[PDB]
Symmetry: D2
Subunit: 292 residues, 4 copies
């Protein structure tokens, strides 16, 4: 069994005053809440039991939004991160939730999209030992954890926000772990930046030869809503795809149904109060149209 | 002396699920909350005393974001509209706030921008008798109150969301009134749509020969940010202007300073907590740069 | 070996006056000419010998832009389509070019993108019998050839621009054919719309049980620059991906180098004249950077 | 009084290659119509009917194919070649015969202006009969343009061309109005350090004589430059947003011609006919019966 975690807290200050009223992850991307996107990523990976970690103030907001998850065939739980003191804190806050299971962590403002994503997730998901992360070529690797490869394509180093990046491959905000992750996180000390760093957790696996680094090719989109510009671009990206296709991206209701976590009747009931708009009309359409 | 009202409620049904555990007029338009835009419009009209009317759920959210306005040299008050039963309800909810003063109403999701806008507003503000509204050419006039002109350019009729519009001129969501408006609203009955209609208020002034309809030229932008698509377009519009100019659109801090409602010391103190980002850095710059 | 055709002609009357000056397929999509995109698609399918068909006025302009292709390891040839009388005319105009070989046709204004695209292409291109086309879920199937599937997923009918589509699956503007296509096209007569239709070619194959319809999943982007709005959307889509990734979409120089059709020395020479710009700088970077 | 117009639509295309290998930047569409319609429309709105379009030797025939002699729009369009992009002031040398003994105006072919009361801002400048007039606009990146510095009283005191350390954030836009002194000023210029015959140097000549009028173009106007891939996209989106919202089109020369009475209703109807199967033609037709304020 693999349990999921969505880390959806974080500083806030960079995007104020936009984020003074609404935290990033509660800011919607085009037609649905930002959190739907990383949630749908965990769902597509086959994960149904998910811990949502947020700020003290947002945690109840997330509860109002998503509830216990039973509507979507999920088991959703909530915990608080008092201060954004590092991605790795997710494993300390989520220690009891994880128990003795495997796990996966996704960042609440990360938006993934592309063909054969289910396979990419599936292969990481099937690894019962070690950790798996994904490498994506970016313009600005200095903003991320950076993974360096040797001439043979083997991952050989990790550095967090390096002033002098060794490659243009960023480690994306999606991570799969075996049962070791909690104890690794328990042993970490704050970095210079003052954070309990996921890069340090991933490096612990790398130095034991237990880190799988999979390329996420250029045909995928991996976007982050970290800036005003990047939220706008992400919105435009989703809107172009949706309006071209007549399909919606990262609808949890759709994914639940396709995965047999909810049935047609359940789906019909979810669509009713959204009936007056495109999103409800869309869910109803799913009951009678085959989509490959 | 004119008091202002921002009517920022409305059914959110259309925009769900994007706006579920948050407020729709708190969504960013690019880089700042949507409500900053209409607020800035009233401020540019020389209005300091403003009543913000929203839903039971969202009114507290506005208060938390904007406070009493004193930081910006404003007097902000708040009131609740229990149910979205008409734009004209603003004048009933707002009756005691208005007192014996002139007034102006702007809708929370209306974004205006253009050259000489302060003159356009100044002109309506300086009419102490009757009402003033603005007509703007649109592609889909059936969505709005529509104003028909005679061959001489005189306004001759108003219809609310007509099936067969008599022109392509929509009445925008910005309205200036003398002391007759509360009494006119007091006497209204709900329409066939089942709403207490601002068009019926504007028609009451027109039937007495006391409605001024001013053309808002095609050089102005009048955007309505109340749909997912139109929110994205508005965001891009503001981003293009801001990044081209190195100026920000609709910063209340700037407008308050320019109007001498707050002094330099005050502006400096507002910028401090936003210092880490572009917005705080911008406010600081206004202290030592002349902008015409 | 399979030969390719890019049909890059067509009535421009729609996009006038924007295309009064230029053929639609010479307009840039963001940072490079539209024709680079379908050219790159053929290259990615392993096709090196390509006939570009355009109008009398433009064909020489395409020759000016692309030359004989030798610089990119290609064999580019040219032919004129006197009048835009149907997509199937490509096979009559290109009869001598195709000779006794397998072939592929791509429309000059079609932009495809997504993960594992080279696999989707290679599988169709490496078939040696029948015809292969791709079905993509769209909002507006009435604008395209539409494929209807039975309950088992088997394609059962094709209709060109039906007013009441039987599905939401459009046939995309990318077609792969065995040696039967020319004789099929020769027997066609103009449709009700006045055109020699590729849909009729594809039906001929379907009737013989020799049409392979492969799904192009929602993870792929299939865009059409046929309208002002859609060309703008496609530009933003490419811009977002490029700026995120620090990679460029559909650079023929890159693809030729990667396929080993040109070497490093040749790539370096192609970059030099573009060195003062981002595109040339990019081609240079590819010489010392490994991209997975 | 008549003013003659010049659109300088030449330039090194190297930057935008390969997008502009096929087409010159100034023929690329901004959303729905060719880039050059925009600065052409600016001149038209200023009351200028007689215009010289300057471009490279390769592009000159392309502009001539698109626009012709302008008679269909009530204009008198002429063409000339700039052999090499050796300075904006070259426009006055190349255009000397064309200008003759008249007032003149120069607009750059990739400059897009839009906003309320723009006709008034233009008419004020164009109706002056002395000196030069230019416009100052606040930008984020003044180092890309000519930059004007003001004193504490708002009077222009200096001009610098593409300064590494701008003295202000006010760029001089690519729209210039001149009296009959300009040709002789340009004739006396020598190339700058950038190796160009600079319009900034022409403008400084006027400033030194106290004959340069620098008018602020306020923040409510949009002044966009389509000279990069990103900027052309943003400009397209800007136009598309306004057009789709309004049901009106920006910088349609047929509309402006008709509104200025340079062509009549029958003429407009004929222009609409060949574009009728699209929205641009349908739009021209609509203008014959709808009053637009
Ligand atoms: C550092 C940190 C980030 N975050 C969130 C914000 C985004 O959803 C995500 C990315 O954060 P970042 O802005 O530091 O790159 O992780 C936390 O939730 N907690 C933390 O301690
Ligand atoms: C190799 C290569 C692929 N492509 C396109 C083909 C696809 O749409 C995508 C390949 O993505 P992938 O590596 O994730 O399968 O990139 C380029 O545009 N240029 C290239 O050089
Ligand atoms: C009808 C109504 C609208 N509104 C807000 C909703 C939008 O933000 C805007 C548009 O209203 P309308 O298009 O339904 O006339 O007005 C209220 O705040 N209260 C109301 O009673
Ligand atoms: C009259 C006219 C104006 N314009 C432009 C000029 C300004 O940018 C704008 C005029 O706006 P205004 O009517 O609000 O002053 O519209 C056109 O693009 N076409 C026209 O036919
Ligand atoms: C009908 C037709 C289209 N075309 C071109 C124009 C495009 O690249 C594409 C389809 O254009 P369309 O928007 O007119 O259907 O193929 C031709 O080259 N020849 C033709 O006979
Ligand atoms: C099945 C499904 C996939 N997706 C996303 C996941 C990947 O980003 C993408 C998969 O596309 P594919 O079918 O071409 O592999 O679509 C949804 O957004 N909703 C869904 O219901
Ligand atoms: C210098 C120069 C520029 N131009 C064009 C190029 C641009 O589109 C614009 C701005 O040029 P600039 O950025 O080099 O001052 O003017 C010419 O047509 N001829 C010239 O001699
Ligand atoms: C003074 C000021 C105006 N504006 C807006 C009001 C109008 O839409 C526009 C005025 O432009 P203008 O100076 O060209 O008349 O700018 C702000 O957004 N912030 C400000 O501080």
């Amino acid at each position: 069994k693999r349990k999921g975690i969505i880390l959806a807290g974080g500083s806030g200050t960079r995007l104020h005053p936009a984020t003074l009223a609404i935290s990033k992850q509660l800011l919607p991307v085009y037609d649905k809440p930002m959190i739907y996107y990383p949630l749908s990523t965990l769902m597509l990976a086959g994960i149904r039991e998910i811990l949502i970690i947020s700020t003290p103030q947002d945690t109840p907001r997330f509860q109002q939004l998503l509830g216990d998850g039973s509507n979507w065939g999920l088991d959703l739980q909530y915990a608080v991160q008092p201060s954004p003191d590092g991605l790795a804190q997710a494993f300390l806050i989520g220690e009891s939730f994880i128990g003795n299971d495997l796990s996966a962590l996704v960042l609440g403002d990360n938006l993934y999209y592309g063909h054969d994503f289910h396979e990419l997730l599936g292969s990481a998901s099937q690894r019962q030992t070690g950790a798996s992360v994904f490498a994506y070529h970016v313009l600005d690797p200095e903003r991320y954890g950076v993974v360096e490869f040797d001439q043979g394509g083997k991952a050989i180093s990790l550095e967090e926000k390096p002033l002098e990046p060794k490659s243009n491959y960023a480690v994306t905000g999606l991570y799969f772990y075996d049962q070791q992750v909690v104890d690794i996180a328990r042993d970490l000390k704050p970095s210079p930046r003052g954070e309990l760093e996921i890069t340090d957790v991933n490096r612990a696996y790398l130095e034991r030869g237990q880190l799988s680094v999979e390329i996420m090719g250029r045909g995928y989109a991996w976007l982050d809503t970290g800036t005003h510009d990047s939220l706008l671009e992400a919105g435009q990206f989703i809107a172009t795809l949706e309006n071209r296709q007549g399909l919606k991206v990262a609808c949890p209701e759709e994914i639940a149904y396709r995965q047999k976590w909810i049935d047609a009747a359940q789906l019909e009931k979810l669509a009713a109060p959204l009936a007056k708009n495109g999103y409800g009309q869309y869910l109803k359409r799913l009951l009678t149209e085959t989509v490959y």
